[PDB]
Amino acid sequence: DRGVNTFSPEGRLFQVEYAIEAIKLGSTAIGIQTSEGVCLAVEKRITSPLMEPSSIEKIVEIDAHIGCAMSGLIADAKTLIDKARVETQNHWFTYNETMTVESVTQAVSNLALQFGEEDADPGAMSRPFGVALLFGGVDEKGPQLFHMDPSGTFVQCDARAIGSASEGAQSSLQEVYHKSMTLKEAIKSSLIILKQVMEEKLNATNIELATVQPGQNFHMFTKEELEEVIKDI
Amino acid sequence: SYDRAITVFSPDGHLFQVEYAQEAVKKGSTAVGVRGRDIVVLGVEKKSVAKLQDERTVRKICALDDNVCMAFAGLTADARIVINRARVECQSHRLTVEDPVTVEYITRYIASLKQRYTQSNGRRPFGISALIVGFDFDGTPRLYQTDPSGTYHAWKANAIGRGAKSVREFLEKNYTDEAIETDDLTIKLVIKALLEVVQSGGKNIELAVMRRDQSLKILNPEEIEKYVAEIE
Amino acid sequence: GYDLSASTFSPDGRVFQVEYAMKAVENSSTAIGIRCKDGVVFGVEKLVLSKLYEEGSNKRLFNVDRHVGMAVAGLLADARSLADIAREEASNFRSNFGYNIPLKHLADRVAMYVHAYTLYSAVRPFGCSFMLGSYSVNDGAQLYMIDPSGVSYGYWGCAIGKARQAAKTEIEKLQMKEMTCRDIVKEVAKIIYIVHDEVKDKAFELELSWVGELTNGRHEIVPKDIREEAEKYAKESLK
Amino acid sequence: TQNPMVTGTSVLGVKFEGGVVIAADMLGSYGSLARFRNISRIMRVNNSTMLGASGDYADFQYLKQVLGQMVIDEELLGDGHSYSPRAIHSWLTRAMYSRRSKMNPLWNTMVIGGYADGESFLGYVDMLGVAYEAPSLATGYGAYLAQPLLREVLEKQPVLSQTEARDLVERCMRVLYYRDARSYNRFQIATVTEKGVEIEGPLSTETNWDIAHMIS
Amino acid sequence: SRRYDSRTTIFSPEGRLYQVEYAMEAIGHAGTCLGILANDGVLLAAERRNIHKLLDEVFFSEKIYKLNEDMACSVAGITSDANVLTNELRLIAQRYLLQYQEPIPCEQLVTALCDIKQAYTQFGGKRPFGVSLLYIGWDKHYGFQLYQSDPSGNYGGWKATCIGNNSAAAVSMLKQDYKEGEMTLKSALALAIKVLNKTMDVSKLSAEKVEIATLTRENGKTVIRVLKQKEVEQLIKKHE
Amino acid sequence: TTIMAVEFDGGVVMGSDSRVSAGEAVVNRVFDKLSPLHERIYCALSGSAADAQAVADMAAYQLELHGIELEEPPLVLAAANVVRNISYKYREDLSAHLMVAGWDQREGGQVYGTLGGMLTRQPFAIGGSGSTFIYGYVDAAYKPGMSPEECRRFTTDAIALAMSRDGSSGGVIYLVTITAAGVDHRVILGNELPKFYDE
Amino acid sequence: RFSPYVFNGGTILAIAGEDFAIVASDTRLSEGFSIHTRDSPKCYKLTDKTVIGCSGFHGDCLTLTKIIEARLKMYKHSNNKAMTTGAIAAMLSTILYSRRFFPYYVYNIIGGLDEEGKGAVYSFDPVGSYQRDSFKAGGSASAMLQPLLDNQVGFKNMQNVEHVPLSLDRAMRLVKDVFISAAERDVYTGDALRICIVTKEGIREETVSLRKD
Amino acid sequence: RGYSFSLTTFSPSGKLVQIEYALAAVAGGAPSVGIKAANGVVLATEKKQKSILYDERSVHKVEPITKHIGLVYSGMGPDYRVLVHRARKLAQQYYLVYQEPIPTAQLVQRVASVMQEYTQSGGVRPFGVSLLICGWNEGRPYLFQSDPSGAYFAWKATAMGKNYVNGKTFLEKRYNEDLELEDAIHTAILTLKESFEGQMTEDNIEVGICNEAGFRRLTPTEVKDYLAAI
Amino acid sequence: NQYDNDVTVWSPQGRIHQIEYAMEAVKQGSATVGLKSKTHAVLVALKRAQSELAAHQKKILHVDNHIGISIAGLTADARLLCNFMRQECLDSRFVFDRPLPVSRLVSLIGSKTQIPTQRYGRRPYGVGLLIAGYDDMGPHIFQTCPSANYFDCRAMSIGARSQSARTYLERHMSEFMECNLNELVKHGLRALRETLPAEQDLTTKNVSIGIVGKDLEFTIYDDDDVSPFLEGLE
């Protein structure tokens, strides 16, 4: 057995490779960036009708202008979400302004490779976050969607698919996306791809959807709105 | 101090310690709950009848507050730890907010705690799944399931412990708005559920009951046995 | 094997980690010093690994204090760390005791420092040797050579690196007890040009230094004119 | 160091074309007593910097050992980067200030002068963190007696030849001898220029007492 | 370094803490110990392993320790660990008596300790205590009580139980021979000497191979008493 | 308290009175104010006698470790740098004053002054509460280049003067002459103190 | 008793127009009954849009400005943009308050251009407690310059006077004439004037002479 | 920094194998013997003395812990020095706190605790010594045996080290409750004499006695006298 | 197999396998090339794009007014070590009131990355940096490596396939002291394009240029910003 901080013969940490394999088992989520704002839709993958559909929340709020989709070990991403929340609010307190998306995804990105087993002044994190986040939001620079992964690399992306069927779905993103796209077109397109990828038959329950527009705050589409958008199928 | 990384990924992305803890839950004494109109019932299977046994100190259905109680299954000691931490945290919440905790608050708390011990130095994951049932201050019924992985959910009625596959199949089949129209149909739902898995219809689980804005109500095994003959 | 950490004697009683680290010093490039009547001189077979590097990259002659020089070898980062530890040592001694630290006590302290890492599984040995030079009116010239084991020996002539044996056979050809610095510099030059296997690992630099009477005890790198006359004569002695 | 045990008197500082010159008498007092009469209160930090200090003397020696330790640690690197007088000034400002922030104040009133790159710097740092440049400085009562002479002459001539500066310092120190009770006719004059720091001393001050026979 | 870690705080491929169950093997090899809960008192009966040699018997008993005014505990297995646990329980109950000015109930005490044994069983990587404990103590809430705790930190109240060697045969004999709520103190003595007679395979039972201490109530005070040897010979002879 | 040191060619001479008074009644009328820090390095105590003693002992410890570790007698400059560091680091807590004096191969006799945590070599470094009464005498009678007997009779005279005037000083006058040969501890009884103008 | 605060005097001033923000201060650095230097300008260029004044205990002026600028490069590193005047104001409120129990005894007045190119001046106190005004004086001579700036800039207690917008020149003559009105009377004001004008074009610096006596 | 996990883990059979092995180490130690009389306690232990070069009076196995307590061990020497210094520390804490000579049952409880702490702490092996602590107070003799596992037994008379089984069987037939102190010493010295292999002398067997007057070692003269008549 | 699990295990050949495997990380990074002239220190980075829709990850990081870096390898390590560098420079401009000399900076980084390379259970920083910095001694281009060793280079190319760029840079290093800014950046872009596959091309997107010199504080040029310097490229 080896440590958590071991580099393989190829030059990647083991735990980041095995962790980025662990994200491959999560439910596929997708969001797309447009000049009108950015949308976010994620498959819930309900396991049983006894479940409450509103329980699985894979698209949560980080502040009035930053919606954080995720995929993978949903338990791990709680520390990330609360980290980002405390961050942007402390930023608001100190500097009296909303916090940019790049600042947030960078700050929360600082926690990935903060893991070890010998420094450990507290009982600090003993493995990389098995979470792949997709911080979406708008700032003075406008709409932006920053991917993030367990390896801590936060990259700006126009539209990105993460999770189980992220491979094919991403091919659909490069297939369909174009810069001049309108936001409702974004919603329709992403729901089309999810319908392509999901195992179960799609409905307004086993998914969610949120967007953040230049004047609109973060918002999660309720059941009726989701149905109204799925009427196009 | 012991700072080895016990819980580490494996060559599939799996956290083997988490799958193993969930193995320990899958051998736990089967528990079930349901969410009714004004009542919330939990049933904990039998566990260890053992005629010399004492009933009171071997139950799985502890109180977390006036409006929040919980079953579980698995390493009972660990669940005693989580129950204690949740109790202290409920009271600290009444100290810092003056408002009794929503079920969402305490459940999301304990889910955070289990998540931390899944991911820290020298600490094994808890082997407990907790079906915390309770009433928000508005009085709505609440069922939250929390497993060793730390992911929690609202639930209509979900079963944990050994054989939770067949019992969960049961609530999938029999949970209907006719089923929870009244109290006794609800409780005969729970016991009607475990009876597929209980050791002959029983005592051999006794249960627990909570009414809206009423403290946790337990059952003695007589009234359990009335329902026993009523379903058998 | 039995060799997985320093805190494990073999069945024969050899802490294999220290011996291995010595095998790390021996793969590096040879450096030599010679204590003489009036000071100490250092040469450095500093192989330059590509034409891109600046003239002066990867210097292996440091300044742990103004009256003490330091020539290293082997894994070089560890050499730098010994530079920081030694510099902290002399600084601590000037703040405590108010004068230049005697080099002997400095190789005691540093030698205990290197030795502090050959007892635990929690850390590994420094894989680097090095030489210290000093001159003072009170004690003359002195040259100590710490190795990965932490042992400190005083030498009249030293050599550490890959060609240590040939450099020793070259150093024994000298009456270094009866030479001065300005003549020692040439001979150290001839040593480095001789011991250097040229056809394998070509393209090194010569990086010299002394400390003694002519520098008033202040350790300073060699003047470029003296280095170049030195290389000129040594190369001429190759012929 | 809440209380001063062995203090010095006023230090004088004055620029001039191509270098800075300061003086500080070699006296070290203990109360009204003139206990130590041959202590030097002007340090050479390197070829381009030289420092002075009134007030507590022990803390001055702490700043000698620490400060010379810094410049020696920096000379060790041999990387060609040496602290200009502005760096040393700013550093003493920060150390003095922080010590103030802990209410453990170094009871010095230092006056750092230097000459790097043909620009005569002349700093000031007192115990509380006050700092600034100036063409003419004088700590202690020197800011009362010699300071008006120096700002008077520099007002008459903001650019001074070196010897004119040296006479100006000598004459200011004459005033300090006549009128400053904690003074003494034994002072060093430090000159920092292109060539380097030169510390002349112990010097002395001719004194006139013709007025002593005027009272009648 | 990681070669050396035994990893005593990890689950198995089937969800079974190897160190806790191995410890259960150790206590499984310990001397049997059983007490009975009755109406007029409680008795503990433990097979001694100080059997017989040039030992001195300087103490009053072997496996029975006194915990407060009102409780008593019996250990089984690792003797040293039993010492550490006993000292810790005394410290707990006396801290409760400092901080509340009343005796500590048995349930609170057992929970306070079992949180400790669980704590070692979870993190820190130390080996768990291989020491099972049977407690007896009176409290003004719930009356006479019997608490069995084991290395895993789990505990339960019992009316009569036996831990250690041949614990299965002992609990079996209790199931066949315990009259719930109708066992008297003397009936408890007789039954206990019954079970210990049948289980202890060393063969003719002596007064030297066991000890029994009983706890009852007397004049608003609790009495914790060990049986002198004459009473033990009397009760074994009566058993014949 | 009146301790005094002098520098002459072969070594030094550390005179010191022998009274330690508690307020207005004396506690000890014989007290050697010269505790050795090494074989040839004495420190003349003063001020808080307890504090001065602790300072002398700690300084003797460090000077002995540093002494053996180099395997050569520690230079007096070393000693006055350690006593200077320990007197400066605690200057708010120690009312001590230690005119540390001695000999060493590299420099010969030395007398470093360390009042308040400072370090200044001096020809004659007098200290103590009675030292404020003999500045006149020592300034009027000190001529550089003193033979040893001149130093001994000199400091005996000076401390005699301080003893006659000062209340914080009385008793006998200890004298030690530190040179390359070794230390020569001597005592001046009250019947031998050279008498001065008494009225 | 060691006293850790000394009043090194020197007054600052700040005004906000429709498109600019002047900041001005005397450079007499007094103490007790002397003049340390007749040159120590109490305005410190923070960014291209923000000119911060500091009066009072000169040491804490130095330390406080140094800490501010360090925070500006921290912000610029973690956010890829210089702090506006709003952020600098709030951040200097938490800096000045995080030492609530041993204050920075430095009357700041941050004047500059917000992101709308409009004037803004945030006058502070030694323990935080900021606000946005249209004009402000601070330091030694605040009480002699404040009312006159109410009069010729706030137009208070006037009748039949058109509240014309504050033009850059008339703000200039107000600044210089009021500092002369202080130099006549305030002991701590004089020896120079450091007027820094802020516009979108950058920061242009202007100095003025005053009474030396 | 050091290893933090216990090195002694329950073997799958549940018996702590490191304490089995440590007990095997004490079982190989030099033989020791202790017997409790009616008025005191004897301690006599065999000197496994190599070459005559040894200054036998240089170090002793029977060290006093206070004026009334002794110690003999069997196995690893330096470990024993650890437990001796620890015991002296404990008895001194007790004497400061309560102002009374520490009762031997107490001291054996604490030192037993310290011997236990290392069967469980991080990265330390258990001790390799089995103490015999003899003590007198309340007008009564005490003799305890502590083992590597930390448990201590109260004994009439005991034996440990090499051949401790034949030693104990030798004591079962030769210890009687009314044995006065000197005849006790005779019985112990005979006990060692059964398997000494080397012709005991007053140099190579130590003898300790604890009675009402306190504990002490018998000088090799006196021990020579007791080595008479055998 | 039994020697490659730890940083603190010397092989029988006297090599720390974890450190070498750490350098394999920077060898896999996206190629970044620096170099310098008599007056300027230029950086040139190929910002990898994971997906077509994804944006090329940033490889350049502002460190202070006169010092900039170019990471290649484990990115989060790069931002950690970058935060350290920034804290160093801010502390120097705080205390000493002058910009930190670059060589001292790379010395601090050297001692920093050396620590885990020798203590058990730590891991070497898998981030290989180029640092450009101008100070009184002229422009600088330091290379740092997972082995904690730092270099002082005329021009160095790190990243995947960097050997080609170092080959070209040997072909033309002798000209670099005299080149002006634009010609210099042309050299950098050419050598960096020597690394990529033949068909793929430098564009305004996948290139970043951070220049710093005498009369110029450090400045980073992004996708549209490299247009001016992004031309010709024979």
PDB file of N, CA, C and O in Angstrom, chain G residues 11-33:
ATOM      1  N   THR G  11      -3.033  69.106   8.234  1.00  0.00           N
ATOM      2  CA  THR G  11      -4.436  68.955   7.881  1.00  0.00           C
ATOM      3  C   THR G  11      -4.549  68.477   6.446  1.00  0.00           C
ATOM      4  O   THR G  11      -3.728  68.847   5.605  1.00  0.00           O
ATOM      5  N   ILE G  12      -5.555  67.656   6.161  1.00  0.00           N
ATOM      6  CA  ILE G  12      -5.836  67.262   4.790  1.00  0.00           C
ATOM      7  C   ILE G  12      -7.168  67.867   4.388  1.00  0.00           C
ATOM      8  O   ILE G  12      -7.870  68.474   5.198  1.00  0.00           O
ATOM      9  N   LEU G  13      -7.515  67.685   3.118  1.00  0.00           N
ATOM     10  CA  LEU G  13      -8.753  68.220   2.579  1.00  0.00           C
ATOM     11  C   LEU G  13      -9.129  67.425   1.348  1.00  0.00           C
ATOM     12  O   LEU G  13      -8.255  66.973   0.611  1.00  0.00           O
ATOM     13  N   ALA G  14     -10.423  67.259   1.127  1.00  0.00           N
ATOM     14  CA  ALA G  14     -10.891  66.516  -0.027  1.00  0.00           C
ATOM     15  C   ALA G  14     -12.225  67.076  -0.477  1.00  0.00           C
ATOM     16  O   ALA G  14     -13.073  67.421   0.347  1.00  0.00           O
ATOM     17  N   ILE G  15     -12.410  67.154  -1.788  1.00  0.00           N
ATOM     18  CA  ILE G  15     -13.622  67.696  -2.378  1.00  0.00           C
ATOM     19  C   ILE G  15     -14.029  66.792  -3.526  1.00  0.00           C
ATOM     20  O   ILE G  15     -13.171  66.187  -4.174  1.00  0.00           O
ATOM     21  N   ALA G  16     -15.331  66.672  -3.758  1.00  0.00           N
ATOM     22  CA  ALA G  16     -15.845  65.861  -4.849  1.00  0.00           C
ATOM     23  C   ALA G  16     -16.671  66.738  -5.773  1.00  0.00           C
ATOM     24  O   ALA G  16     -17.579  67.440  -5.322  1.00  0.00           O
ATOM     25  N   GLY G  17     -16.352  66.701  -7.062  1.00  0.00           N
ATOM     26  CA  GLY G  17     -17.120  67.396  -8.066  1.00  0.00           C
ATOM     27  C   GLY G  17     -17.973  66.432  -8.871  1.00  0.00           C
ATOM     28  O   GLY G  17     -18.305  65.330  -8.443  1.00  0.00           O
ATOM     29  N   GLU G  18     -18.332  66.877 -10.071  1.00  0.00           N
ATOM     30  CA  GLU G  18     -19.098  66.014 -10.959  1.00  0.00           C
ATOM     31  C   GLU G  18     -18.206  64.980 -11.627  1.00  0.00           C
ATOM     32  O   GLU G  18     -18.681  63.912 -12.029  1.00  0.00           O
ATOM     33  N   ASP G  19     -16.914  65.279 -11.775  1.00  0.00           N
ATOM     34  CA  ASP G  19     -16.031  64.389 -12.516  1.00  0.00           C
ATOM     35  C   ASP G  19     -14.642  64.272 -11.899  1.00  0.00           C
ATOM     36  O   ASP G  19     -13.771  63.609 -12.467  1.00  0.00           O
ATOM     37  N   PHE G  20     -14.403  64.882 -10.746  1.00  0.00           N
ATOM     38  CA  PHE G  20     -13.058  64.853 -10.197  1.00  0.00           C
ATOM     39  C   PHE G  20     -13.116  64.653  -8.696  1.00  0.00           C
ATOM     40  O   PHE G  20     -14.187  64.514  -8.106  1.00  0.00           O
ATOM     41  N   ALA G  21     -11.938  64.633  -8.085  1.00  0.00           N
ATOM     42  CA  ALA G  21     -11.809  64.629  -6.639  1.00  0.00           C
ATOM     43  C   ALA G  21     -10.418  65.104  -6.258  1.00  0.00           C
ATOM     44  O   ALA G  21      -9.440  64.365  -6.392  1.00  0.00           O
ATOM     45  N   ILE G  22     -10.345  66.336  -5.776  1.00  0.00           N
ATOM     46  CA  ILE G  22      -9.126  66.921  -5.246  1.00  0.00           C
ATOM     47  C   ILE G  22      -8.865  66.316  -3.881  1.00  0.00           C
ATOM     48  O   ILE G  22      -9.804  65.937  -3.176  1.00  0.00           O
ATOM     49  N   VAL G  23      -7.593  66.191  -3.521  1.00  0.00           N
ATOM     50  CA  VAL G  23      -7.183  65.929  -2.149  1.00  0.00           C
ATOM     51  C   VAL G  23      -5.983  66.812  -1.861  1.00  0.00           C
ATOM     52  O   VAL G  23      -5.098  66.949  -2.710  1.00  0.00           O
ATOM     53  N   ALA G  24      -5.959  67.428  -0.689  1.00  0.00           N
ATOM     54  CA  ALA G  24      -4.920  68.392  -0.382  1.00  0.00           C
ATOM     55  C   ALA G  24      -4.566  68.315   1.088  1.00  0.00           C
ATOM     56  O   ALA G  24      -5.417  68.022   1.929  1.00  0.00           O
ATOM     57  N   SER G  25      -3.305  68.595   1.394  1.00  0.00           N
ATOM     58  CA  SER G  25      -2.877  68.643   2.781  1.00  0.00           C
ATOM     59  C   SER G  25      -1.643  69.514   2.883  1.00  0.00           C
ATOM     60  O   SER G  25      -0.866  69.632   1.936  1.00  0.00           O
ATOM     61  N   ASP G  26      -1.484  70.136   4.044  1.00  0.00           N
ATOM     62  CA  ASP G  26      -0.252  70.825   4.369  1.00  0.00           C
ATOM     63  C   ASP G  26       0.848  69.808   4.646  1.00  0.00           C
ATOM     64  O   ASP G  26       0.585  68.663   5.016  1.00  0.00           O
ATOM     65  N   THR G  27       2.096  70.221   4.464  1.00  0.00           N
ATOM     66  CA  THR G  27       3.204  69.312   4.705  1.00  0.00           C
ATOM     67  C   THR G  27       4.071  69.740   5.873  1.00  0.00           C
ATOM     68  O   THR G  27       5.224  69.317   5.957  1.00  0.00           O
ATOM     69  N   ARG G  28       3.566  70.575   6.762  1.00  0.00           N
ATOM     70  CA  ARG G  28       4.237  70.776   8.029  1.00  0.00           C
ATOM     71  C   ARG G  28       4.012  69.555   8.897  1.00  0.00           C
ATOM     72  O   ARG G  28       2.876  69.138   9.112  1.00  0.00           O
ATOM     73  N   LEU G  29       5.099  68.984   9.392  1.00  0.00           N
ATOM     74  CA  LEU G  29       5.036  67.818  10.254  1.00  0.00           C
ATOM     75  C   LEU G  29       5.486  68.236  11.639  1.00  0.00           C
ATOM     76  O   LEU G  29       6.643  68.028  12.009  1.00  0.00           O
ATOM     77  N   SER G  30       4.563  68.789  12.410  1.00  0.00           N
ATOM     78  CA  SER G  30       4.883  69.410  13.678  1.00  0.00           C
ATOM     79  C   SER G  30       4.871  68.375  14.783  1.00  0.00           C
ATOM     80  O   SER G  30       4.428  67.240  14.603  1.00  0.00           O
ATOM     81  N   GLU G  31       5.383  68.787  15.937  1.00  0.00           N
ATOM     82  CA  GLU G  31       5.295  67.982  17.143  1.00  0.00           C
ATOM     83  C   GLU G  31       5.740  68.832  18.315  1.00  0.00           C
ATOM     84  O   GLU G  31       6.810  69.445  18.263  1.00  0.00           O
ATOM     85  N   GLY G  32       4.929  68.870  19.357  1.00  0.00           N
ATOM     86  CA  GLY G  32       5.292  69.665  20.514  1.00  0.00           C
ATOM     87  C   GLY G  32       5.327  71.131  20.153  1.00  0.00           C
ATOM     88  O   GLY G  32       4.293  71.795  20.037  1.00  0.00           O
ATOM     89  N   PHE G  33       6.534  71.661  19.992  1.00  0.00           N
ATOM     90  CA  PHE G  33       6.736  73.058  19.646  1.00  0.00           C
ATOM     91  C   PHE G  33       7.788  73.246  18.567  1.00  0.00           C
ATOM     92  O   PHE G  33       8.461  74.278  18.545  1.00  0.00           O
TER      93      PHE G  33
END
